[PDB]
Amino acid sequence: TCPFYKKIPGTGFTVDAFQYGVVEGCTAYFLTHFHSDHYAGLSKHFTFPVYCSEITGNLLKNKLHVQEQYIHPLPLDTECIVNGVKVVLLDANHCPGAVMILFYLPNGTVILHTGDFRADPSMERSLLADQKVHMLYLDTTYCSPEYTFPSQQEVIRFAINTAFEAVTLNPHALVVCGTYSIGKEKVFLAIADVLGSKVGMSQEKYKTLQCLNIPEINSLITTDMCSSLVHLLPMMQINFKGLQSHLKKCGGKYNQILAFRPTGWTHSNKFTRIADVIPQTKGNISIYGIPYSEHSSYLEMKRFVQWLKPQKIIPTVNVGTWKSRSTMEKYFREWKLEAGY
Ligand code: NI
């Protein structure tokens, strides 16, 4: 049944709750972003109001064929009324179209639902600075102190420098980048920009990217693989067998593959710096795992929460085991005693 951490008290609303059938008492279903564990259940047969960003609404119409009459896109950073309740959508710094949602309950309670997010100090100057938040529904994906990772900027500088050096040393090398969802577009777009190429990809992935309102996108991507020297493949294909196979397909145009797997966290992060990352190599194929995250590190999460000073935290991730729930509750209490709220 629908878990309590997907329901907004004092309203008829749910958040990211499309896989439970008709949730009794729900008058409006919000969707924070277009990732499959969150939209699971939606299709052209859905007949209740969906509230989302404009980009998420484009993906629902074009990829899932949800009918237009049930898609209710909202602008960001704008007070809107939904079924009698004031709401605001804020940029979550996750994937394209991802939002956090502020609910202003009739009784005076204010609720923030982060959806999935990567906390940032810029959020401390949004509409969140303007009133107190009582309850926080928090993306706790990486809520443990082992989870450190570099800035997105540091990771893209490493990728651009590695790719540019490899292709200038060997003009017959191909660059491949893995993907299985929206998000992390800066990785393949920044590498193609430094090389003077478009990114080549499948018709399905090209359609997805054309839903994202990314400026000048027609200048950056293509379905013509032959003209491109940065290719996107399914993340599953980013291994030695899948890559050797791909290289056969290119008909002797290339003699070397340099591949990137933008993972979340990997336990080389506890030891190794970004400067010190090395690939796995077999023959003329090399694979780099790069720690490009679209979720908060531990420290980023902690700063946001100590700034916000909520009265109550409701975790939305890692909630399925008693040891994970107890560990997170211990960190929340540490943060509150340290900061004095
Ligand atoms: Ni997500």
Side-chain angles (χ1 to χ4, degrees), residues 310-311 313-338:
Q311 297 176 359
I313 303 174
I314 302 179
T316 69
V317 189
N318 303 315
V319 294
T321 83
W322 298 117
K323 188 184 142 210
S324 300
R325 281 194 157 285
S326 173
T327 299
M328 292 184 292
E329 290 174 4
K330 287 178 28 262
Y331 296 132
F332 308 149
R333 187 56 61 178
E334 291 176 10
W335 300 356
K336 174 177 169 91
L337 291 169
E338 182 183 28

PDB file of all heavy atoms in Angstrom, residues 310-338, unseen atoms left out:
ATOM      1  N   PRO A 310      14.355  22.530  10.046  1.00  0.00           N
ATOM      2  CA  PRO A 310      13.003  21.972  10.155  1.00  0.00           C
ATOM      3  C   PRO A 310      12.642  21.383  11.541  1.00  0.00           C
ATOM      4  O   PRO A 310      13.533  20.920  12.224  1.00  0.00           O
ATOM      5  CB  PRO A 310      13.032  20.840   9.039  1.00  0.00           C
ATOM      6  CG  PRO A 310      14.471  20.331   9.197  1.00  0.00           C
ATOM      7  CD  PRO A 310      15.298  21.632   9.313  1.00  0.00           C
ATOM      8  N   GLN A 311      11.357  21.401  11.896  1.00  0.00           N
ATOM      9  CA  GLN A 311      10.872  20.783  13.138  1.00  0.00           C
ATOM     10  C   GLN A 311      10.791  19.289  13.109  1.00  0.00           C
ATOM     11  O   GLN A 311      10.991  18.620  14.107  1.00  0.00           O
ATOM     12  CB  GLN A 311       9.509  21.343  13.580  1.00  0.00           C
ATOM     13  CG  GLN A 311       9.586  22.852  13.904  1.00  0.00           C
ATOM     14  CD  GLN A 311       8.213  23.437  14.238  1.00  0.00           C
ATOM     15  OE1 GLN A 311       7.216  22.743  14.211  1.00  0.00           O
ATOM     16  NE2 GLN A 311       8.183  24.708  14.558  1.00  0.00           N
ATOM     17  N   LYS A 312      10.580  18.720  11.918  1.00  0.00           N
ATOM     18  CA  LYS A 312      10.420  17.282  11.710  1.00  0.00           C
ATOM     19  C   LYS A 312      11.003  16.920  10.311  1.00  0.00           C
ATOM     20  O   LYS A 312      10.706  17.606   9.316  1.00  0.00           O
ATOM     21  CB  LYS A 312       8.967  16.800  11.829  1.00  0.00           C
ATOM     22  CG  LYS A 312       8.843  15.265  11.791  1.00  0.00           C
ATOM     23  CD  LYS A 312       7.420  14.726  12.030  1.00  0.00           C
ATOM     24  N   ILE A 313      11.809  15.846  10.293  1.00  0.00           N
ATOM     25  CA  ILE A 313      12.379  15.238   9.028  1.00  0.00           C
ATOM     26  C   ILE A 313      11.723  13.867   8.758  1.00  0.00           C
ATOM     27  O   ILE A 313      11.722  13.006   9.695  1.00  0.00           O
ATOM     28  CB  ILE A 313      13.912  15.176   9.077  1.00  0.00           C
ATOM     29  CG1 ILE A 313      14.546  16.571   9.312  1.00  0.00           C
ATOM     30  CG2 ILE A 313      14.469  14.605   7.760  1.00  0.00           C
ATOM     31  CD1 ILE A 313      16.022  16.549   9.513  1.00  0.00           C
ATOM     32  N   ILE A 314      11.282  13.646   7.509  1.00  0.00           N
ATOM     33  CA  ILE A 314      10.736  12.396   7.022  1.00  0.00           C
ATOM     34  C   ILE A 314      11.637  11.908   5.878  1.00  0.00           C
ATOM     35  O   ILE A 314      11.574  12.468   4.769  1.00  0.00           O
ATOM     36  CB  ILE A 314       9.272  12.540   6.546  1.00  0.00           C
ATOM     37  CG1 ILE A 314       8.330  13.066   7.690  1.00  0.00           C
ATOM     38  CG2 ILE A 314       8.714  11.216   5.959  1.00  0.00           C
ATOM     39  CD1 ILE A 314       6.889  13.254   7.273  1.00  0.00           C
ATOM     40  N   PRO A 315      12.474  10.930   6.118  1.00  0.00           N
ATOM     41  CA  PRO A 315      13.308  10.393   5.005  1.00  0.00           C
ATOM     42  C   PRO A 315      12.492   9.754   3.934  1.00  0.00           C
ATOM     43  O   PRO A 315      11.455   9.087   4.268  1.00  0.00           O
ATOM     44  CB  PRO A 315      14.217   9.335   5.657  1.00  0.00           C
ATOM     45  CG  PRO A 315      13.881   9.348   7.040  1.00  0.00           C
ATOM     46  CD  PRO A 315      12.740  10.234   7.373  1.00  0.00           C
ATOM     47  N   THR A 316      12.894   9.851   2.663  1.00  0.00           N
ATOM     48  CA  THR A 316      12.220   9.195   1.507  1.00  0.00           C
ATOM     49  C   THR A 316      13.079   8.088   0.825  1.00  0.00           C
ATOM     50  O   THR A 316      12.545   7.473  -0.120  1.00  0.00           O
ATOM     51  CB  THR A 316      11.713  10.228   0.466  1.00  0.00           C
ATOM     52  OG1 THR A 316      12.846  10.835  -0.185  1.00  0.00           O
ATOM     53  CG2 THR A 316      10.807  11.217   1.177  1.00  0.00           C
ATOM     54  N   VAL A 317      14.291   7.911   1.256  1.00  0.00           N
ATOM     55  CA  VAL A 317      15.223   6.936   0.669  1.00  0.00           C
ATOM     56  C   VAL A 317      15.939   6.155   1.722  1.00  0.00           C
ATOM     57  O   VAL A 317      16.281   6.675   2.794  1.00  0.00           O
ATOM     58  CB  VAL A 317      16.266   7.611  -0.277  1.00  0.00           C
ATOM     59  CG1 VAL A 317      17.111   6.552  -1.082  1.00  0.00           C
ATOM     60  CG2 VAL A 317      15.566   8.562  -1.244  1.00  0.00           C
ATOM     61  N   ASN A 318      16.224   4.849   1.504  1.00  0.00           N
ATOM     62  CA  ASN A 318      16.848   3.972   2.500  1.00  0.00           C
ATOM     63  C   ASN A 318      15.902   3.669   3.709  1.00  0.00           C
ATOM     64  O   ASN A 318      16.449   3.390   4.812  1.00  0.00           O
ATOM     65  CB  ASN A 318      18.239   4.456   2.940  1.00  0.00           C
ATOM     66  CG  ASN A 318      19.187   4.599   1.800  1.00  0.00           C
ATOM     67  OD1 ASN A 318      19.338   3.794   0.920  1.00  0.00           O
ATOM     68  ND2 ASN A 318      19.742   5.856   1.698  1.00  0.00           N
ATOM     69  N   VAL A 319      14.621   3.722   3.482  1.00  0.00           N
ATOM     70  CA  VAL A 319      13.615   3.586   4.551  1.00  0.00           C
ATOM     71  C   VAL A 319      13.193   2.126   4.787  1.00  0.00           C
ATOM     72  O   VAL A 319      12.482   1.855   5.780  1.00  0.00           O
ATOM     73  CB  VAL A 319      12.367   4.410   4.369  1.00  0.00           C
ATOM     74  CG1 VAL A 319      12.742   5.901   4.460  1.00  0.00           C
ATOM     75  CG2 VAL A 319      11.668   4.125   3.083  1.00  0.00           C
ATOM     76  N   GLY A 320      13.776   1.202   4.039  1.00  0.00           N
ATOM     77  CA  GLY A 320      13.233  -0.217   4.077  1.00  0.00           C
ATOM     78  C   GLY A 320      13.885  -1.049   5.114  1.00  0.00           C
ATOM     79  O   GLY A 320      13.343  -2.188   5.296  1.00  0.00           O
ATOM     80  N   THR A 321      14.902  -0.647   5.854  1.00  0.00           N
ATOM     81  CA  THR A 321      15.517  -1.489   6.900  1.00  0.00           C
ATOM     82  C   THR A 321      15.595  -0.745   8.222  1.00  0.00           C
ATOM     83  O   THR A 321      15.762   0.523   8.272  1.00  0.00           O
ATOM     84  CB  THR A 321      16.897  -2.055   6.566  1.00  0.00           C
ATOM     85  OG1 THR A 321      17.949  -1.084   6.833  1.00  0.00           O
ATOM     86  CG2 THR A 321      17.036  -2.590   5.149  1.00  0.00           C
ATOM     87  N   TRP A 322      15.447  -1.424   9.333  1.00  0.00           N
ATOM     88  CA  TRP A 322      15.460  -0.772  10.618  1.00  0.00           C
ATOM     89  C   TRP A 322      16.822  -0.205  10.903  1.00  0.00           C
ATOM     90  O   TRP A 322      16.879   0.912  11.545  1.00  0.00           O
ATOM     91  CB  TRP A 322      14.997  -1.724  11.790  1.00  0.00           C
ATOM     92  CG  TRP A 322      13.624  -2.190  11.628  1.00  0.00           C
ATOM     93  CD1 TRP A 322      13.197  -3.528  11.453  1.00  0.00           C
ATOM     94  CD2 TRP A 322      12.429  -1.409  11.673  1.00  0.00           C
ATOM     95  NE1 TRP A 322      11.853  -3.540  11.301  1.00  0.00           N
ATOM     96  CE2 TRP A 322      11.330  -2.265  11.472  1.00  0.00           C
ATOM     97  CE3 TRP A 322      12.178  -0.001  11.813  1.00  0.00           C
ATOM     98  CZ2 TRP A 322       9.966  -1.781  11.440  1.00  0.00           C
ATOM     99  CZ3 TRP A 322      10.832   0.453  11.771  1.00  0.00           C
ATOM    100  CH2 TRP A 322       9.775  -0.427  11.555  1.00  0.00           C
ATOM    101  N   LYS A 323      17.910  -0.846  10.567  1.00  0.00           N
ATOM    102  CA  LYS A 323      19.269  -0.310  10.811  1.00  0.00           C
ATOM    103  C   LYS A 323      19.512   0.988   9.994  1.00  0.00           C
ATOM    104  O   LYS A 323      20.057   1.933  10.584  1.00  0.00           O
ATOM    105  CB  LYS A 323      20.315  -1.334  10.539  1.00  0.00           C
ATOM    106  CG  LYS A 323      21.717  -0.946  10.947  1.00  0.00           C
ATOM    107  CD  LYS A 323      22.735  -2.050  10.536  1.00  0.00           C
ATOM    108  CE  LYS A 323      24.063  -1.467  10.048  1.00  0.00           C
ATOM    109  NZ  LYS A 323      24.788  -2.309   9.022  1.00  0.00           N
ATOM    110  N   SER A 324      19.048   1.055   8.779  1.00  0.00           N
ATOM    111  CA  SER A 324      19.184   2.310   7.969  1.00  0.00           C
ATOM    112  C   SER A 324      18.322   3.385   8.599  1.00  0.00           C
ATOM    113  O   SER A 324      18.837   4.556   8.780  1.00  0.00           O
ATOM    114  CB  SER A 324      18.653   2.103   6.566  1.00  0.00           C
ATOM    115  OG  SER A 324      19.337   1.081   5.896  1.00  0.00           O
ATOM    116  N   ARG A 325      17.070   3.195   8.936  1.00  0.00           N
ATOM    117  CA  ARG A 325      16.205   4.197   9.550  1.00  0.00           C
ATOM    118  C   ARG A 325      16.806   4.690  10.884  1.00  0.00           C
ATOM    119  O   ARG A 325      16.845   5.942  11.151  1.00  0.00           O
ATOM    120  CB  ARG A 325      14.790   3.652   9.781  1.00  0.00           C
ATOM    121  CG  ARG A 325      13.837   3.580   8.628  1.00  0.00           C
ATOM    122  CD  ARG A 325      12.344   3.336   9.128  1.00  0.00           C
ATOM    123  NE  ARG A 325      11.289   3.749   8.196  1.00  0.00           N
ATOM    124  CZ  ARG A 325      10.884   5.003   7.935  1.00  0.00           C
ATOM    125  NH1 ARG A 325      11.445   6.056   8.544  1.00  0.00           N
ATOM    126  NH2 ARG A 325       9.902   5.192   7.038  1.00  0.00           N
ATOM    127  N   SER A 326      17.276   3.818  11.763  1.00  0.00           N
ATOM    128  CA  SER A 326      17.870   4.228  13.048  1.00  0.00           C
ATOM    129  C   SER A 326      19.126   5.040  12.877  1.00  0.00           C
ATOM    130  O   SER A 326      19.318   6.024  13.608  1.00  0.00           O
ATOM    131  CB  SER A 326      18.143   2.931  13.874  1.00  0.00           C
ATOM    132  OG  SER A 326      18.873   3.343  15.023  1.00  0.00           O
ATOM    133  N   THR A 327      19.961   4.681  11.935  1.00  0.00           N
ATOM    134  CA  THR A 327      21.260   5.381  11.653  1.00  0.00           C
ATOM    135  C   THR A 327      20.891   6.781  11.189  1.00  0.00           C
ATOM    136  O   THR A 327      21.522   7.796  11.652  1.00  0.00           O
ATOM    137  CB  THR A 327      22.130   4.575  10.692  1.00  0.00           C
ATOM    138  OG1 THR A 327      22.437   3.279  11.300  1.00  0.00           O
ATOM    139  CG2 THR A 327      23.450   5.190  10.431  1.00  0.00           C
ATOM    140  N   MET A 328      20.002   6.922  10.260  1.00  0.00           N
ATOM    141  CA  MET A 328      19.637   8.286   9.762  1.00  0.00           C
ATOM    142  C   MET A 328      19.082   9.169  10.890  1.00  0.00           C
ATOM    143  O   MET A 328      19.453  10.375  10.971  1.00  0.00           O
ATOM    144  CB  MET A 328      18.628   8.239   8.589  1.00  0.00           C
ATOM    145  CG  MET A 328      19.205   7.654   7.348  1.00  0.00           C
ATOM    146  SD  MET A 328      18.175   7.648   5.883  1.00  0.00           S
ATOM    147  CE  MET A 328      16.841   6.432   6.347  1.00  0.00           C
ATOM    148  N   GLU A 329      18.228   8.620  11.742  1.00  0.00           N
ATOM    149  CA  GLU A 329      17.622   9.361  12.874  1.00  0.00           C
ATOM    150  C   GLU A 329      18.706   9.845  13.838  1.00  0.00           C
ATOM    151  O   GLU A 329      18.613  10.993  14.355  1.00  0.00           O
ATOM    152  CB  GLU A 329      16.546   8.537  13.597  1.00  0.00           C
ATOM    153  CG  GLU A 329      15.255   8.308  12.780  1.00  0.00           C
ATOM    154  CD  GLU A 329      14.241   7.349  13.458  1.00  0.00           C
ATOM    155  OE1 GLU A 329      14.522   6.937  14.598  1.00  0.00           O
ATOM    156  OE2 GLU A 329      13.186   6.993  12.855  1.00  0.00           O
ATOM    157  N   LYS A 330      19.771   9.067  14.020  1.00  0.00           N
ATOM    158  CA  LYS A 330      20.940   9.475  14.853  1.00  0.00           C
ATOM    159  C   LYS A 330      21.657  10.666  14.228  1.00  0.00           C
ATOM    160  O   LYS A 330      22.056  11.632  14.898  1.00  0.00           O
ATOM    161  CB  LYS A 330      21.891   8.329  15.129  1.00  0.00           C
ATOM    162  CG  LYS A 330      21.263   7.334  16.150  1.00  0.00           C
ATOM    163  CD  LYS A 330      22.144   6.130  16.435  1.00  0.00           C
ATOM    164  CE  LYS A 330      23.620   6.415  16.251  1.00  0.00           C
ATOM    165  NZ  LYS A 330      24.149   5.966  14.934  1.00  0.00           N
ATOM    166  N   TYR A 331      21.901  10.645  12.928  1.00  0.00           N
ATOM    167  CA  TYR A 331      22.479  11.855  12.242  1.00  0.00           C
ATOM    168  C   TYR A 331      21.580  13.049  12.370  1.00  0.00           C
ATOM    169  O   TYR A 331      22.109  14.191  12.652  1.00  0.00           O
ATOM    170  CB  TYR A 331      22.842  11.539  10.761  1.00  0.00           C
ATOM    171  CG  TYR A 331      23.916  10.510  10.603  1.00  0.00           C
ATOM    172  CD1 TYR A 331      23.797   9.433   9.723  1.00  0.00           C
ATOM    173  CD2 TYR A 331      25.063  10.671  11.313  1.00  0.00           C
ATOM    174  CE1 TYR A 331      24.833   8.463   9.694  1.00  0.00           C
ATOM    175  CE2 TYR A 331      26.048   9.760  11.266  1.00  0.00           C
ATOM    176  CZ  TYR A 331      25.933   8.720  10.522  1.00  0.00           C
ATOM    177  OH  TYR A 331      27.192   8.049  10.639  1.00  0.00           O
ATOM    178  N   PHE A 332      20.285  12.954  12.170  1.00  0.00           N
ATOM    179  CA  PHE A 332      19.390  14.098  12.286  1.00  0.00           C
ATOM    180  C   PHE A 332      19.543  14.743  13.704  1.00  0.00           C
ATOM    181  O   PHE A 332      19.615  16.021  13.793  1.00  0.00           O
ATOM    182  CB  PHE A 332      17.951  13.872  11.996  1.00  0.00           C
ATOM    183  CG  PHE A 332      17.680  13.166  10.618  1.00  0.00           C
ATOM    184  CD1 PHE A 332      16.595  12.354  10.505  1.00  0.00           C
ATOM    185  CD2 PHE A 332      18.496  13.389   9.476  1.00  0.00           C
ATOM    186  CE1 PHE A 332      16.325  11.708   9.246  1.00  0.00           C
ATOM    187  CE2 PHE A 332      18.213  12.779   8.265  1.00  0.00           C
ATOM    188  CZ  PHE A 332      17.154  11.926   8.172  1.00  0.00           C
ATOM    189  N   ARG A 333      19.598  13.885  14.695  1.00  0.00           N
ATOM    190  CA  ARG A 333      19.730  14.403  16.106  1.00  0.00           C
ATOM    191  C   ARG A 333      21.072  15.065  16.335  1.00  0.00           C
ATOM    192  O   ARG A 333      21.144  16.196  16.963  1.00  0.00           O
ATOM    193  CB  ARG A 333      19.480  13.306  17.111  1.00  0.00           C
ATOM    194  CG  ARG A 333      19.419  13.789  18.597  1.00  0.00           C
ATOM    195  CD  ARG A 333      18.375  14.880  18.875  1.00  0.00           C
ATOM    196  NE  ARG A 333      17.023  14.359  18.566  1.00  0.00           N
ATOM    197  CZ  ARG A 333      15.841  14.989  18.712  1.00  0.00           C
ATOM    198  NH1 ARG A 333      15.736  16.221  19.188  1.00  0.00           N
ATOM    199  NH2 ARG A 333      14.724  14.341  18.391  1.00  0.00           N
ATOM    200  N   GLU A 334      22.149  14.500  15.819  1.00  0.00           N
ATOM    201  CA  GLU A 334      23.448  15.157  15.878  1.00  0.00           C
ATOM    202  C   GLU A 334      23.319  16.550  15.247  1.00  0.00           C
ATOM    203  O   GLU A 334      23.634  17.589  15.861  1.00  0.00           O
ATOM    204  CB  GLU A 334      24.606  14.363  15.235  1.00  0.00           C
ATOM    205  CG  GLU A 334      25.024  13.082  15.981  1.00  0.00           C
ATOM    206  CD  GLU A 334      26.111  12.259  15.280  1.00  0.00           C
ATOM    207  OE1 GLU A 334      26.676  12.758  14.310  1.00  0.00           O
ATOM    208  OE2 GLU A 334      26.367  11.109  15.706  1.00  0.00           O
ATOM    209  N   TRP A 335      22.830  16.628  14.013  1.00  0.00           N
ATOM    210  CA  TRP A 335      22.749  17.950  13.348  1.00  0.00           C
ATOM    211  C   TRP A 335      21.975  18.966  14.113  1.00  0.00           C
ATOM    212  O   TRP A 335      22.434  20.179  14.167  1.00  0.00           O
ATOM    213  CB  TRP A 335      22.086  17.728  11.944  1.00  0.00           C
ATOM    214  CG  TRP A 335      22.838  16.783  11.000  1.00  0.00           C
ATOM    215  CD1 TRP A 335      24.025  16.168  11.148  1.00  0.00           C
ATOM    216  CD2 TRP A 335      22.304  16.314   9.751  1.00  0.00           C
ATOM    217  NE1 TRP A 335      24.300  15.306  10.076  1.00  0.00           N
ATOM    218  CE2 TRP A 335      23.239  15.423   9.225  1.00  0.00           C
ATOM    219  CE3 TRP A 335      21.103  16.565   9.056  1.00  0.00           C
ATOM    220  CZ2 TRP A 335      23.023  14.776   7.951  1.00  0.00           C
ATOM    221  CZ3 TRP A 335      20.882  15.920   7.815  1.00  0.00           C
ATOM    222  CH2 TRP A 335      21.856  15.063   7.307  1.00  0.00           C
ATOM    223  N   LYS A 336      20.900  18.602  14.721  1.00  0.00           N
ATOM    224  CA  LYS A 336      20.018  19.506  15.478  1.00  0.00           C
ATOM    225  C   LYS A 336      20.774  19.949  16.755  1.00  0.00           C
ATOM    226  O   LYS A 336      20.707  21.192  17.065  1.00  0.00           O
ATOM    227  CB  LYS A 336      18.762  18.784  15.807  1.00  0.00           C
ATOM    228  CG  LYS A 336      17.761  19.446  16.685  1.00  0.00           C
ATOM    229  CD  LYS A 336      16.512  18.589  16.862  1.00  0.00           C
ATOM    230  CE  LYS A 336      15.591  19.104  17.967  1.00  0.00           C
ATOM    231  NZ  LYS A 336      14.603  20.046  17.423  1.00  0.00           N
ATOM    232  N   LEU A 337      21.462  19.058  17.475  1.00  0.00           N
ATOM    233  CA  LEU A 337      22.208  19.484  18.686  1.00  0.00           C
ATOM    234  C   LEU A 337      23.371  20.384  18.336  1.00  0.00           C
ATOM    235  O   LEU A 337      23.671  21.307  19.118  1.00  0.00           O
ATOM    236  CB  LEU A 337      22.673  18.246  19.446  1.00  0.00           C
ATOM    237  CG  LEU A 337      21.583  17.406  20.132  1.00  0.00           C
ATOM    238  CD1 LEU A 337      22.074  16.072  20.625  1.00  0.00           C
ATOM    239  CD2 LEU A 337      21.149  18.196  21.376  1.00  0.00           C
ATOM    240  N   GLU A 338      24.113  20.150  17.283  1.00  0.00           N
ATOM    241  CA  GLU A 338      25.223  20.956  16.850  1.00  0.00           C
ATOM    242  C   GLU A 338      24.755  22.352  16.523  1.00  0.00           C
ATOM    243  O   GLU A 338      25.499  23.355  16.881  1.00  0.00           O
ATOM    244  CB  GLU A 338      26.017  20.352  15.681  1.00  0.00           C
ATOM    245  CG  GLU A 338      27.239  21.152  15.228  1.00  0.00           C
ATOM    246  CD  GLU A 338      27.967  20.586  14.021  1.00  0.00           C
ATOM    247  OE1 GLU A 338      27.316  19.915  13.195  1.00  0.00           O
ATOM    248  OE2 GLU A 338      29.201  20.813  13.892  1.00  0.00           O
TER     249      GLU A 338
END
